Amino acid sequence: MSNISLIVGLGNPGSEYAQTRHNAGFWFVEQLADKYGITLKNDPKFHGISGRGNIEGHDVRLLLPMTYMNRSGQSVVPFSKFYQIAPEAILIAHDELDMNPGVIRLKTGGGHGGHNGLRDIVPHIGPNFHRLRIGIGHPGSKERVSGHVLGKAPSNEQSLMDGAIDHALSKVKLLVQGQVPQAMNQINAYKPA
């Protein structure tokens, strides 16, 4: 099993989007970058913000597409092709409607599950990349879904999510060291304290 060498966080650009649930992936990758002192810089060539540096003994690339969510593939696809990074070496963090705040899962393969960022990426690199599904809750009904993902969560729900994110952060060592089964067990076992 492949080392994770590219970690992508999905979200929307702009300060009106930064605290919205749909940017759960950006939160994770931004906090990761600063945890390890990796600088995220404008990378217009790949329509994103990107960095690279040492994470627990490995050279890891970080990517935040700046394309807007539904166009995320225009930044992910050419970036991973250009550096010749196989999907099996990619981790994509994103908000997951189908899990509650404070729930977090690592998953390998599968489709987009309705997620409009993943929808723009599976067609072009296939489904064989890892995903960190950061639960954001489901708002009730289909009509509300959109104002939910594009809205800021209340305090209580934000803490749950931040707790889930702190936990996945403490497992990235296993991911970059190629221990994916072990990461999966330990991420998937998380429940708020």
Region of residue 171 (left: phi > 0; alpha: psi -120 to 50; beta: else): alpha
Segments in the chain forming alpha helices (H): 24-35, 73-82, 116-119, 122-125, 145-149, 155-169, 172-176, 180-188
**Nearest of 8, 12, 34 to residue 23 by alpha carbon:** 12
Instruction: Please give the C-alpha separations between residue 97 and each of 39, 43, 44, in angstroms, as whole numbers.
Output: 30, 29, 30
Positions marked catalytic: 22
Which residues, in sequence order, are CB contacts of 69 under 8 Å at separation 6+?
A: 10, 11, 12, 22, 116, 117
Domains with residue ranges and CATH for the chain: 1-193 (3.40.50.1470)
What is the dihedral angle through the alpha carbons of 26, 158, 191, 55, rounded to the nearest 10 degrees? 30
What is the dihedral angle through the alpha carbons of 183, 70, 15, 107, rounded to the nearest 10 degrees? -10
Q: Quick one: resolution in A?
A: 2.2
Extract the annotated binding site for tRNA.
17, 68, 70, 116
Half-sphere exposure of 35 (CA within 13 A, CB side): 17
Extract the annotated binding site.
17, 68, 70, 116
CA gap 93, 8 in Å, rounded: 6
What is the dihedral angle through the alpha carbons of 74, 79, 82, 86, rounded to the nearest 10 degrees? -110
Residue 166 tokens read as 């702190």
Instruction: Please give the C-alpha separations between residue 191 and each of 46, 103, 164, 177, 186, in angstroms, as whole numbers.
Output: 36, 7, 8, 24, 11
Extract the annotated binding site for cytidine.
70, 116
Which technique?
X-ray
